[PDB]
Amino acid sequence: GETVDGLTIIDTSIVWPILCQCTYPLVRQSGKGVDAVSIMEEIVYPDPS
Amino acid sequence: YGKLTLRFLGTLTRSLKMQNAQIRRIRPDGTVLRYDDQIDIEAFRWSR
Amino acid sequence: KLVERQQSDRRQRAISGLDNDRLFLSFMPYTIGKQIYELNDNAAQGKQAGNAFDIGEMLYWTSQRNVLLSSIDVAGMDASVTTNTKDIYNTFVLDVASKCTVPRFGPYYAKNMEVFEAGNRQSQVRYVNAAWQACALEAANSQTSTSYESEIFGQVKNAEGTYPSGRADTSTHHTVLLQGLVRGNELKRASDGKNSCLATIKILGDDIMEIFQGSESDTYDHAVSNASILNESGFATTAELSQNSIVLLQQLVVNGTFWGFADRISLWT
Amino acid sequence: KARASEADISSIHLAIAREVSPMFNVHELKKIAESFEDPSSIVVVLEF
Amino acid sequence: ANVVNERAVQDDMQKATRSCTKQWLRHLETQFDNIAVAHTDHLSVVYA
Amino acid sequence: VGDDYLKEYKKLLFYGVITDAIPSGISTRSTIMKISPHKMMNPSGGALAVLSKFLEAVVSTNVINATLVVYAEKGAGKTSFLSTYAEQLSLASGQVVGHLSSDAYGRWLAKTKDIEEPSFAYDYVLSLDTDDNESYYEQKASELLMSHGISEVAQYELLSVRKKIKMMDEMNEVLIAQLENADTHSERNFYYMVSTGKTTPRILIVEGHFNAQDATIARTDTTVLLRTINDTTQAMRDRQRGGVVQLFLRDTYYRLLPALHTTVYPFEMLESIKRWKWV
Amino acid sequence: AIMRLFTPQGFLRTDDLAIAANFPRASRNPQTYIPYTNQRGTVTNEFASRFRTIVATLANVVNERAVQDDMQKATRSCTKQWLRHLETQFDNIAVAHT
Amino acid sequence: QFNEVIGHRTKSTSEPHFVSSTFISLRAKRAELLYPEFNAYINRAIQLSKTQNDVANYYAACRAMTNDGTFLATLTELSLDAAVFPRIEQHLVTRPAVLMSNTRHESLKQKYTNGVGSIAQSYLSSFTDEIAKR
Amino acid sequence: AGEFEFSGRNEKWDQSLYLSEHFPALFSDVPLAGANTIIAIMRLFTPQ
Amino acid sequence: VQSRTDVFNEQFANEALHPMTKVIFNGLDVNTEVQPLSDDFKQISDPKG
Amino acid sequence: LNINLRALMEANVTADDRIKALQAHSMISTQFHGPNQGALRPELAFDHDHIIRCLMLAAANYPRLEGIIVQINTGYVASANVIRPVSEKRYFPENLEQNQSAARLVSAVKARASEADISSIHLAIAREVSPMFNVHELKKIAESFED
RNA sequence: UUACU
Ligand SMILES: O=c1ccn([C@@H]2O[C@H](COP(=O)(O)OP(=O)(O)OP(=O)(O)O)[C@@H](O)[C@H]2O)c(=O)[nH]1
Ligand SMILES: [Mg+2]
Ligand SMILES: [Mg+2]
């Protein structure tokens, strides 16, 4: 029960913001989003360092 | 209307090589068919 | 001619009362920049609610975790818009009007103009519609100065290059612009390997108000670039941000509570 | 009401004239983003 | 009308939503009869 | 037929339109191919009336110190042009006009960078420029071209756009240091006190190179944009002590001067004097 | 049959770039679990079509339940309008997940 | 999401490390630009405040000390310099590559090249294909 | 020889394929044994 | 000899279209650096017994 | 001083095998090039038997180590620009919240929907590949299954 | 004596 400030408590809500109120990079085309048409994303590849 | 027409098109011509330019049908694959006597018009046989 | 109107706490401010024909050239940039409002939420709220729905956005994100909130006024946003900064709205109003087909609009008609095509020598006649013609003329022609007849002096005239804020598009030209600069930042930051980490942003020009999320270091790396690109756009953003503090349309929201600003309603002036 | 659009005089005259015009640039469709989710989505099929 | 009939009754929607759909499908019937007299007499001589 | 471009150059500048997309590319070594009589072209009802505001504010005794602001490129050849348009307006108005000759900030600030109280008088400004005093920006530009080491015009062609454009961005930051505040050596103080102080003429004509000098020139409702019969970058390889310093700054100023004002076409200002009804 | 709907749609991916990097792993074969497959070059989405056949079961469980409590056609059809509204919002975002 | 109150939590307002550096610069300007009794009323509200409700008590009350609601009216020749004079804060904004121009050399179609505007048209130019149907 | 060679793949159409040897397969007007509903809807797109 | 792209009025319009990024670099384009995986050994010069 | 040298030279791995530690901590099918320093720049191999043996003492004596590992994994997700929140709600289709007969439904969607925190969505994604040192447990969903 | 959203 040693919680790590909200780590072990799993909230299975958290599929409703994933399903609705989030914009994704590969959803912002077509889209389908708050783009509101088609615009761009230029996918970010994060650095290893 | 001529110069206006002439202007409209209106500046690029020097891309196509015009060495022995003929008018031939192609296959939808992309090979140039020969002159077929019974499909093409008479004026496409020898582009004079 | 310079109309003057004053507010509760701002200094004595002037705005330009345009006649019907100078109002006419600004109208097609007003109608083009109007339809971005229905398209993008974040081109945002008009104040029809009166009650809690004008703040029901700001009451929610302040109630959340790991958020820093910035609320930006640029300082003076009539001045700053030089003619060159004004041009960023002019491309958007042009580039809509070419793909469109508007016949006649007013005292125009879709006709056959001589158009120079850069990297062509020689004029080649495109077909332009009336929206195109009108917008080009208005964009070209723009006189900005306000001229006030004085009882002291003869006729004092403002040195132009401001934004003559009465034209038609005085609410869209500062909305469509700042929407392009802050949202366009998270394309440019995504273009070179940095994340975006910005949630919903509400722009009623000039009042910018964006909402960030992540660690306390990630959001700040974005919060500087939203300042620094507005700093390099020729704008004096004043400076405001905080964790749990947010303002928009002179209505403070904090901690999930609503603070009033009671003194702005002067009962007796 | 989402599909139907105001009857601009300029493009009804264009769609008639495109029918017997020669096609040189290959035409392409406006990107219709519909779902075909509800049984009210037959309006797109009646459009076609 | 029979295609939208099967899709409405497979997914058990209202009696009124199926009726107000089919009342719309025959409002396009009335409007098509009123203008086909003008298409097939005056548009068709222009395409000729 | 087939005389050069410098023979009767003065009449062609006063009355010509080079109907070609800029860069047209005519030069002082260019000759004539053919001549045919053509219709007298008609001036610009949208650009006649903007210039007609200044030709009303010069007339009325109401408006104190009207001002005409003329933007062009660095090689449009307007200091040789609007020196005689002062001579066409003052003889028609019966007043005294004087053009500030467009570089008189740059010639003057090089002379007194150092001086705590400078002389803002009108007679001191005009007895200073054209040409022997170097401009201040041509000192700054001159130092800058060196740092990305370059001294030849043909070497400037070898440089290309984004590697060039970063040099232009570096060139700007010495611009804004004279535009931002109203210090005692800034641009805003110079075009104010020259325009106010009683020794000056009633209706000066300033000329600006780059746009967003509009917050500095003062004060007017009439800013025009001059497009002469001159491929201006050809005239900067002409200039005949041009070098790269003249040609870098035309390029820098074209990056700061778009056509967001009324193009004015130098025969139309000579046309509007004539139309106006005088006393 | 309802507990068959909880099965994952993924694959057991081996850690090839961890062993060659000689990184520490607390098992013999390091086999982490990816939740869903990559979906290039396809018209339909094989992960978003799994959710089509789950709601095709769940809109029949809620339909067999609501007719047993003989409730309204209006209160039941508006539920089934929402169950296929999850279909439209799943087909949009499963392109970015997979 | 749908603005009803669902919970209460205790969330600790300590503004982060980089705005604590803006406190040192601002409190020096608080000391000299203000009347010292108005300043001493403020410095008690920093120190005495114990709840989030308590800062709200002082803030609306310190706000009405800086305003009288009087609309600030003079003759507008005095405020022409202050209000609508154009300022250039620091940078110049550069111009577009003009692609098309009509018979007079003026902007007809134009595109941005690596500026501040090119950041803006990276977002905005996507809408020109849809708004042209609205 | 005049046969129809169906591809057997599930591809999104593009107008690049309009100049090639591929056709849209909804408009084959060939009755598939087991798909007599989709083909019957495609008999409504015939011209008149 | 220039026609006509060396003039900046036509060069600036042909760089908004297809903006050039890549330059000729006949070496190896270093963009990242790597730290050692374990600072394990000290590197003294004259050892003491 | 000879044991420390006979491990640094006979391990036969170089500084060029630091690249294999970069192909793991970056995206799949990335490509690295150069510099090919060769055997003039040697290095120990990454000690496999020791680190996995001391992560099992660190997991036993320090059960907060899951907070270290997840914070690294959360920091990769938020730096990847992979899922970002937004203000627009589309939980319901066009005119269903306004519909009267579905008021029993929308009072359970909003009621569920309202709590889960954002950006615990950013956190969770880091739970689908972290180690487990504390046993996770469910946030109490007290329901009745009546309607 | 007086602007637009
Ligand atoms: O009557 C009004 C009032 C306000 N506005 C609005 O004013 C905006 C420009 O005004 P600013 O909002 O930029 O003024 P400022 O904040 O920089 O001034 P300070 O607070 O710093 O003192 C414009 O973008 C516009 O939309 C009007 O157009 N008309
Ligand atoms: Mg403001
Ligand atoms: Mg404001």
PDB file of N, CA and C in Angstrom, chain F residues 207-272:
ATOM      1  N   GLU F 207      11.321  61.201 -47.830  1.00  0.00           N
ATOM      2  CA  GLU F 207      11.260  59.964 -48.588  1.00  0.00           C
ATOM      3  C   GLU F 207      11.858  58.890 -47.710  1.00  0.00           C
ATOM      4  N   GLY F 208      11.229  57.725 -47.687  1.00  0.00           N
ATOM      5  CA  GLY F 208      11.697  56.616 -46.887  1.00  0.00           C
ATOM      6  C   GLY F 208      12.122  55.471 -47.778  1.00  0.00           C
ATOM      7  N   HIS F 209      13.118  54.723 -47.316  1.00  0.00           N
ATOM      8  CA  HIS F 209      13.516  53.522 -48.032  1.00  0.00           C
ATOM      9  C   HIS F 209      12.631  52.339 -47.668  1.00  0.00           C
ATOM     10  N   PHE F 210      12.639  51.955 -46.401  1.00  0.00           N
ATOM     11  CA  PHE F 210      11.988  50.736 -45.965  1.00  0.00           C
ATOM     12  C   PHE F 210      10.678  51.050 -45.263  1.00  0.00           C
ATOM     13  N   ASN F 211       9.689  50.193 -45.493  1.00  0.00           N
ATOM     14  CA  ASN F 211       8.425  50.237 -44.784  1.00  0.00           C
ATOM     15  C   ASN F 211       8.662  49.889 -43.312  1.00  0.00           C
ATOM     16  N   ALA F 212       7.680  50.234 -42.473  1.00  0.00           N
ATOM     17  CA  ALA F 212       7.817  50.408 -41.022  1.00  0.00           C
ATOM     18  C   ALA F 212       8.892  51.428 -40.676  1.00  0.00           C
ATOM     19  N   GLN F 213       9.010  52.455 -41.496  1.00  0.00           N
ATOM     20  CA  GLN F 213       9.479  53.764 -41.092  1.00  0.00           C
ATOM     21  C   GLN F 213       8.282  54.682 -40.872  1.00  0.00           C
ATOM     22  N   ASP F 214       7.074  54.137 -41.039  1.00  0.00           N
ATOM     23  CA  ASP F 214       5.828  54.878 -40.899  1.00  0.00           C
ATOM     24  C   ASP F 214       5.587  55.357 -39.478  1.00  0.00           C
ATOM     25  N   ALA F 215       6.125  54.657 -38.488  1.00  0.00           N
ATOM     26  CA  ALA F 215       6.071  55.092 -37.102  1.00  0.00           C
ATOM     27  C   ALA F 215       7.110  56.152 -36.779  1.00  0.00           C
ATOM     28  N   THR F 216       7.848  56.633 -37.774  1.00  0.00           N
ATOM     29  CA  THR F 216       8.922  57.585 -37.567  1.00  0.00           C
ATOM     30  C   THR F 216       8.698  58.893 -38.318  1.00  0.00           C
ATOM     31  N   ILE F 217       8.403  58.814 -39.620  1.00  0.00           N
ATOM     32  CA  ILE F 217       8.035  59.992 -40.396  1.00  0.00           C
ATOM     33  C   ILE F 217       6.764  60.601 -39.831  1.00  0.00           C
ATOM     34  N   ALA F 218       6.698  61.924 -39.827  1.00  0.00           N
ATOM     35  CA  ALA F 218       5.626  62.581 -39.104  1.00  0.00           C
ATOM     36  C   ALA F 218       5.337  63.935 -39.730  1.00  0.00           C
ATOM     37  N   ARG F 219       4.058  64.243 -39.937  1.00  0.00           N
ATOM     38  CA  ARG F 219       2.921  63.347 -39.733  1.00  0.00           C
ATOM     39  C   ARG F 219       2.006  63.561 -40.925  1.00  0.00           C
ATOM     40  N   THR F 220       1.383  62.505 -41.439  1.00  0.00           N
ATOM     41  CA  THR F 220       0.718  62.650 -42.721  1.00  0.00           C
ATOM     42  C   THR F 220      -0.418  61.657 -42.883  1.00  0.00           C
ATOM     43  N   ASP F 221      -1.216  61.907 -43.917  1.00  0.00           N
ATOM     44  CA  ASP F 221      -2.211  60.970 -44.409  1.00  0.00           C
ATOM     45  C   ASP F 221      -1.904  60.496 -45.816  1.00  0.00           C
ATOM     46  N   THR F 222      -0.694  60.748 -46.310  1.00  0.00           N
ATOM     47  CA  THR F 222      -0.388  60.572 -47.727  1.00  0.00           C
ATOM     48  C   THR F 222       0.994  59.947 -47.847  1.00  0.00           C
ATOM     49  N   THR F 223       1.031  58.629 -47.980  1.00  0.00           N
ATOM     50  CA  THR F 223       2.261  57.897 -48.231  1.00  0.00           C
ATOM     51  C   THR F 223       2.098  57.148 -49.542  1.00  0.00           C
ATOM     52  N   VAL F 224       2.968  57.429 -50.506  1.00  0.00           N
ATOM     53  CA  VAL F 224       2.910  56.784 -51.808  1.00  0.00           C
ATOM     54  C   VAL F 224       4.144  55.912 -51.970  1.00  0.00           C
ATOM     55  N   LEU F 225       4.213  55.236 -53.109  1.00  0.00           N
ATOM     56  CA  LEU F 225       5.199  54.195 -53.355  1.00  0.00           C
ATOM     57  C   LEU F 225       5.670  54.355 -54.790  1.00  0.00           C
ATOM     58  N   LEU F 226       6.933  54.690 -54.979  1.00  0.00           N
ATOM     59  CA  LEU F 226       7.401  55.154 -56.280  1.00  0.00           C
ATOM     60  C   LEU F 226       8.059  54.004 -57.036  1.00  0.00           C
ATOM     61  N   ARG F 227       7.574  53.733 -58.242  1.00  0.00           N
ATOM     62  CA  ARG F 227       8.147  52.720 -59.126  1.00  0.00           C
ATOM     63  C   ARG F 227       8.535  53.387 -60.439  1.00  0.00           C
ATOM     64  N   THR F 228       9.832  53.601 -60.636  1.00  0.00           N
ATOM     65  CA  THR F 228      10.343  54.351 -61.769  1.00  0.00           C
ATOM     66  C   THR F 228      10.787  53.418 -62.884  1.00  0.00           C
ATOM     67  N   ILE F 229      11.350  53.983 -63.942  1.00  0.00           N
ATOM     68  CA  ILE F 229      11.827  53.157 -65.049  1.00  0.00           C
ATOM     69  C   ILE F 229      13.282  52.841 -64.736  1.00  0.00           C
ATOM     70  N   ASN F 230      13.467  51.868 -63.855  1.00  0.00           N
ATOM     71  CA  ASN F 230      14.811  51.525 -63.427  1.00  0.00           C
ATOM     72  C   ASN F 230      14.725  50.152 -62.794  1.00  0.00           C
ATOM     73  N   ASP F 231      15.376  49.176 -63.406  1.00  0.00           N
ATOM     74  CA  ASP F 231      15.720  47.956 -62.697  1.00  0.00           C
ATOM     75  C   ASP F 231      16.735  48.372 -61.648  1.00  0.00           C
ATOM     76  N   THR F 232      16.301  48.413 -60.389  1.00  0.00           N
ATOM     77  CA  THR F 232      17.076  49.106 -59.369  1.00  0.00           C
ATOM     78  C   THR F 232      18.335  48.333 -59.003  1.00  0.00           C
ATOM     79  N   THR F 233      18.285  47.007 -59.077  1.00  0.00           N
ATOM     80  CA  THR F 233      19.480  46.225 -58.799  1.00  0.00           C
ATOM     81  C   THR F 233      20.462  46.278 -59.962  1.00  0.00           C
ATOM     82  N   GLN F 234      19.987  46.626 -61.160  1.00  0.00           N
ATOM     83  CA  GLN F 234      20.910  46.888 -62.255  1.00  0.00           C
ATOM     84  C   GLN F 234      21.612  48.218 -62.043  1.00  0.00           C
ATOM     85  N   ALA F 235      20.914  49.176 -61.432  1.00  0.00           N
ATOM     86  CA  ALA F 235      21.510  50.481 -61.182  1.00  0.00           C
ATOM     87  C   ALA F 235      22.466  50.435 -60.002  1.00  0.00           C
ATOM     88  N   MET F 236      22.421  49.362 -59.213  1.00  0.00           N
ATOM     89  CA  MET F 236      23.344  49.251 -58.092  1.00  0.00           C
ATOM     90  C   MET F 236      24.604  48.495 -58.490  1.00  0.00           C
ATOM     91  N   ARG F 237      24.540  47.705 -59.564  1.00  0.00           N
ATOM     92  CA  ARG F 237      25.774  47.245 -60.196  1.00  0.00           C
ATOM     93  C   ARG F 237      26.314  48.311 -61.130  1.00  0.00           C
ATOM     94  N   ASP F 238      25.446  49.235 -61.542  1.00  0.00           N
ATOM     95  CA  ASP F 238      25.904  50.417 -62.257  1.00  0.00           C
ATOM     96  C   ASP F 238      26.719  51.318 -61.344  1.00  0.00           C
ATOM     97  N   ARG F 239      26.195  51.610 -60.139  1.00  0.00           N
ATOM     98  CA  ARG F 239      26.198  52.938 -59.487  1.00  0.00           C
ATOM     99  C   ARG F 239      27.460  53.784 -59.741  1.00  0.00           C
ATOM    100  N   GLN F 240      28.633  53.137 -59.839  1.00  0.00           N
ATOM    101  CA  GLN F 240      29.973  53.638 -60.196  1.00  0.00           C
ATOM    102  C   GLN F 240      30.698  54.333 -59.049  1.00  0.00           C
ATOM    103  N   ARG F 241      30.239  54.121 -57.821  1.00  0.00           N
ATOM    104  CA  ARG F 241      31.092  53.609 -56.746  1.00  0.00           C
ATOM    105  C   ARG F 241      30.174  52.741 -55.877  1.00  0.00           C
ATOM    106  N   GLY F 242      29.419  51.860 -56.548  1.00  0.00           N
ATOM    107  CA  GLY F 242      28.404  51.075 -55.861  1.00  0.00           C
ATOM    108  C   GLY F 242      28.978  50.082 -54.874  1.00  0.00           C
ATOM    109  N   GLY F 243      29.747  49.121 -55.364  1.00  0.00           N
ATOM    110  CA  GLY F 243      30.245  48.064 -54.517  1.00  0.00           C
ATOM    111  C   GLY F 243      29.130  47.151 -54.038  1.00  0.00           C
ATOM    112  N   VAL F 244      29.420  46.421 -52.964  1.00  0.00           N
ATOM    113  CA  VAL F 244      28.397  45.558 -52.394  1.00  0.00           C
ATOM    114  C   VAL F 244      27.554  46.304 -51.377  1.00  0.00           C
ATOM    115  N   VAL F 245      28.031  47.448 -50.885  1.00  0.00           N
ATOM    116  CA  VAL F 245      27.341  48.149 -49.809  1.00  0.00           C
ATOM    117  C   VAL F 245      26.035  48.754 -50.305  1.00  0.00           C
ATOM    118  N   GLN F 246      26.033  49.292 -51.525  1.00  0.00           N
ATOM    119  CA  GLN F 246      24.792  49.777 -52.118  1.00  0.00           C
ATOM    120  C   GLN F 246      23.849  48.626 -52.422  1.00  0.00           C
ATOM    121  N   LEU F 247      24.397  47.499 -52.864  1.00  0.00           N
ATOM    122  CA  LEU F 247      23.581  46.417 -53.391  1.00  0.00           C
ATOM    123  C   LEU F 247      23.052  45.510 -52.286  1.00  0.00           C
ATOM    124  N   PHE F 248      23.782  45.396 -51.173  1.00  0.00           N
ATOM    125  CA  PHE F 248      23.275  44.688 -50.002  1.00  0.00           C
ATOM    126  C   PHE F 248      22.095  45.416 -49.376  1.00  0.00           C
ATOM    127  N   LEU F 249      22.108  46.749 -49.400  1.00  0.00           N
ATOM    128  CA  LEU F 249      21.062  47.511 -48.735  1.00  0.00           C
ATOM    129  C   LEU F 249      19.801  47.659 -49.567  1.00  0.00           C
ATOM    130  N   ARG F 250      19.902  47.668 -50.900  1.00  0.00           N
ATOM    131  CA  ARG F 250      18.704  47.573 -51.730  1.00  0.00           C
ATOM    132  C   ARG F 250      17.986  46.262 -51.462  1.00  0.00           C
ATOM    133  N   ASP F 251      18.744  45.171 -51.448  1.00  0.00           N
ATOM    134  CA  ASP F 251      18.267  43.852 -51.079  1.00  0.00           C
ATOM    135  C   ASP F 251      17.735  43.806 -49.648  1.00  0.00           C
ATOM    136  N   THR F 252      18.404  44.454 -48.692  1.00  0.00           N
ATOM    137  CA  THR F 252      17.882  44.516 -47.330  1.00  0.00           C
ATOM    138  C   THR F 252      16.584  45.311 -47.273  1.00  0.00           C
ATOM    139  N   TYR F 253      16.521  46.434 -47.988  1.00  0.00           N
ATOM    140  CA  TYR F 253      15.332  47.276 -47.915  1.00  0.00           C
ATOM    141  C   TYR F 253      14.163  46.679 -48.682  1.00  0.00           C
ATOM    142  N   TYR F 254      14.422  45.933 -49.765  1.00  0.00           N
ATOM    143  CA  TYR F 254      13.331  45.240 -50.448  1.00  0.00           C
ATOM    144  C   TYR F 254      12.728  44.157 -49.566  1.00  0.00           C
ATOM    145  N   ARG F 255      13.527  43.574 -48.672  1.00  0.00           N
ATOM    146  CA  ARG F 255      13.010  42.648 -47.673  1.00  0.00           C
ATOM    147  C   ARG F 255      12.169  43.367 -46.620  1.00  0.00           C
ATOM    148  N   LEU F 256      12.299  44.681 -46.504  1.00  0.00           N
ATOM    149  CA  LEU F 256      11.508  45.434 -45.544  1.00  0.00           C
ATOM    150  C   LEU F 256      10.427  46.283 -46.192  1.00  0.00           C
ATOM    151  N   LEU F 257      10.416  46.394 -47.516  1.00  0.00           N
ATOM    152  CA  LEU F 257       9.480  47.263 -48.228  1.00  0.00           C
ATOM    153  C   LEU F 257       8.623  46.419 -49.157  1.00  0.00           C
ATOM    154  N   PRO F 258       7.441  45.996 -48.735  1.00  0.00           N
ATOM    155  CA  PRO F 258       6.501  45.396 -49.685  1.00  0.00           C
ATOM    156  C   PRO F 258       5.634  46.468 -50.314  1.00  0.00           C
ATOM    157  N   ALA F 259       4.811  46.098 -51.284  1.00  0.00           N
ATOM    158  CA  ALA F 259       3.964  47.065 -51.976  1.00  0.00           C
ATOM    159  C   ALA F 259       2.614  47.198 -51.273  1.00  0.00           C
ATOM    160  N   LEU F 260       2.675  47.515 -49.982  1.00  0.00           N
ATOM    161  CA  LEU F 260       1.479  47.710 -49.181  1.00  0.00           C
ATOM    162  C   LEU F 260       1.010  49.151 -49.157  1.00  0.00           C
ATOM    163  N   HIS F 261       1.512  49.988 -50.046  1.00  0.00           N
ATOM    164  CA  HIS F 261       0.998  51.333 -50.222  1.00  0.00           C
ATOM    165  C   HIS F 261       0.682  51.554 -51.690  1.00  0.00           C
ATOM    166  N   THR F 262       0.200  52.750 -52.002  1.00  0.00           N
ATOM    167  CA  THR F 262      -0.249  53.032 -53.354  1.00  0.00           C
ATOM    168  C   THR F 262       0.957  53.272 -54.241  1.00  0.00           C
ATOM    169  N   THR F 263       1.124  52.431 -55.257  1.00  0.00           N
ATOM    170  CA  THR F 263       2.110  52.700 -56.294  1.00  0.00           C
ATOM    171  C   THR F 263       1.728  53.966 -57.036  1.00  0.00           C
ATOM    172  N   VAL F 264       2.718  54.795 -57.355  1.00  0.00           N
ATOM    173  CA  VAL F 264       2.420  56.166 -57.735  1.00  0.00           C
ATOM    174  C   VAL F 264       2.924  56.542 -59.128  1.00  0.00           C
ATOM    175  N   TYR F 265       3.915  55.824 -59.711  1.00  0.00           N
ATOM    176  CA  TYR F 265       4.284  55.902 -61.133  1.00  0.00           C
ATOM    177  C   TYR F 265       4.638  57.296 -61.641  1.00  0.00           C
ATOM    178  N   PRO F 266       5.909  57.700 -61.530  1.00  0.00           N
ATOM    179  CA  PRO F 266       6.335  59.115 -61.507  1.00  0.00           C
ATOM    180  C   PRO F 266       5.764  60.133 -62.494  1.00  0.00           C
ATOM    181  N   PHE F 267       5.138  59.695 -63.581  1.00  0.00           N
ATOM    182  CA  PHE F 267       4.421  60.610 -64.464  1.00  0.00           C
ATOM    183  C   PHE F 267       3.086  61.042 -63.884  1.00  0.00           C
ATOM    184  N   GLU F 268       2.587  60.338 -62.871  1.00  0.00           N
ATOM    185  CA  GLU F 268       1.267  60.640 -62.339  1.00  0.00           C
ATOM    186  C   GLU F 268       1.324  61.773 -61.328  1.00  0.00           C
ATOM    187  N   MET F 269       2.460  61.935 -60.653  1.00  0.00           N
ATOM    188  CA  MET F 269       2.625  63.100 -59.800  1.00  0.00           C
ATOM    189  C   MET F 269       2.827  64.362 -60.625  1.00  0.00           C
ATOM    190  N   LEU F 270       3.482  64.251 -61.779  1.00  0.00           N
ATOM    191  CA  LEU F 270       3.566  65.370 -62.707  1.00  0.00           C
ATOM    192  C   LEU F 270       2.243  65.647 -63.407  1.00  0.00           C
ATOM    193  N   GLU F 271       1.352  64.662 -63.473  1.00  0.00           N
ATOM    194  CA  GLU F 271       0.026  64.820 -64.052  1.00  0.00           C
ATOM    195  C   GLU F 271      -0.940  65.485 -63.082  1.00  0.00           C
ATOM    196  N   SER F 272      -0.829  65.174 -61.791  1.00  0.00           N
ATOM    197  CA  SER F 272      -1.779  65.680 -60.812  1.00  0.00           C
ATOM    198  C   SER F 272      -1.539  67.132 -60.429  1.00  0.00           C
TER     199      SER F 272
END
